[PDB]
Structures are given as structure tokens and as C-alpha cells.
Ligand binder design. Structure first.
Ligand SMILES: O=C(O)C1=C[C@H](O)[C@@H](OS(=O)(=O)O)[C@H](O[C@H]2[C@H](O)[C@@H](NS(=O)(=O)O)[C@@H](O[C@H]3[C@H](O)[C@@H](OS(=O)(=O)O)[C@H](O[C@H]4[C@H](O)[C@@H](NS(=O)(=O)O)[C@@H](O)O[C@@H]4COS(=O)(=O)O)O[C@H]3C(=O)O)O[C@@H]2COS(=O)(=O)O)O1
Length: 124
């Protein structure tokens, strides 16, 4: 039951109950409560507690939430400097979960390992 705080702008990842994924700056938003469950060492599924959906990365680079687990719902969790974590798609292996400075999700296809947009600070 954490909250993923993105370094690019200062937005918390959010998972809405309709499938839409985005960021907010309000820390009391109930849709920013997440549950990361490891499938093994280094691989996690990220689910939005309220919405009961998993974060998924689609083939066009989009981020959305799906009610059931698909091979687009898994990500390698890797620790970066200063305790920030990054989540890279186990399917689209060079694409990273990320948020643009405006709060809207960045397409995984436009991401890369040195961007600030992929860095998340996990908070209870
Ligand atoms: O593909 C594009 O759409 C795209 C690519 C190019 O990079 C650039 O287009 S170009 O024609 O000018 O070459 C333009 O880049 C965008 C970039 O896509 C945006 N990233 S997003 O917010 O995720 O959408 C954004 O970048 C800003 C972000 O905060 C961040 O980008 S990223 O790392 O997450 O990809 C990045 O942050 C800088 C930071 O500001 C620096 N801090 S300092 O105070 O200035 O010293 C420093 O710490 O470095 C980081 C990361 O290093 S980097 O920037 O050198 O890679 O950059 C931010 C920024 O540049 O605004 O905006 C750029 C520019 O967009 S603009 O609207 O044209 O201004 O689009």
C-alpha cells in the first residue's frame, strides 16, 4: 500500500476506476494508493487499490489499467540512485512507466533510462 511519487514534476501516479492512468499532485487522492506484488525477485505487478485494476502498458506506448492481469501488466523493478525506483515493461523491454512534467503519462516508447520522467519515489 504505497504511493509512487514521480520526480518529473512531482505527481503521484494514479489509477482511475475506468481504466485511465495519470498523475495528481493531491496526496489524499484515494486512487493513488497502490499495491505492488512481486512475481519473483525484481518483477512486479502494480495495482490501484480502489479501482482494483492493474497498470498495463499497451502496444502503442499508452498506459492504462485493466481489470485483469495480462502480459502487459508486469514490470521489472530496478533501484536507482538516491532510492528512486524504475519500472520497465517485461513485454516491451525498453519502455518505462513514466510521467511527463504536466502530469499526463508519457508513452513508454518515448522513454529512456536517463530520463527524469521514469524516476519514482515509493512512499507508504
Ligand atoms: O520527443 C520529444 O517529444 C521531444 C524530444 C526532445 O527531447 C525535445 O524536442 S527537441 O526538438 O527540442 O529536441 C522535446 O523534449 C521535451 C521532453 O520530451 C519533455 N520530457 S517530458 O516532460 O517527460 O515529456 C520535457 O523535458 C523536461 C522534463 O522535465 C525532463 O525530460 S525527461 O528527462 O523526463 O525526458 C528533462 O529534465 C531535465 C531537467 O530539467 C534538468 N534540470 S535544470 O534545472 O535545468 O538544470 C536536468 O536535471 O536534466 C533533466 C533531464 O536531462 S535532459 O533534459 O537533458 O534530458 O527535461 C525537461 C525539459 O527539457 O523541459 O521537455 C522537453 C523539451 O520540451 S519543449 O516543450 O520543447 O520545451 O521533445
Amino acid at each position: 500500500p504505497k504511493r509512487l511519487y514521480c520526480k518529473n514534476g512531482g505527481f503521484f501516479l494514479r489509477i482511475h476506476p475506468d481504466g485511465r492512468v495519470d498523475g495528481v499532485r493531491e496526496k489524499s487522492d484515494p486512487h493513488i494508493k497502490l499495491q505492488l506484488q512481486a512475481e519473483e525477485r525484481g518483477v512486479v505487478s502494480i495495482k490501484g487499490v480502489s479501482a482494483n485494476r492493474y497498470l498495463a502498458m499497451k502496444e502503442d506506448g499508452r498506459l492504462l489499467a485493466s481489470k485483469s492481469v495480462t502480459d502487459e501488466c508486469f514490470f521489472f523493478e530496478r533501484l536507482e540512485s538516491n532510492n528512486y525506483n524504475t519500472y520497465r515493461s517485461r513485454k516491451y523491454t525498453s519502455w518505462y512507466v513514466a510521467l511527463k512534467r504536466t502530469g499526463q503519462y508519457k508513452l513508454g516508447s518515448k522513454t529512456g533510462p536517463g530520463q527524469k520522467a521514469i524516476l519514482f519515489l515509493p512512499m507508504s
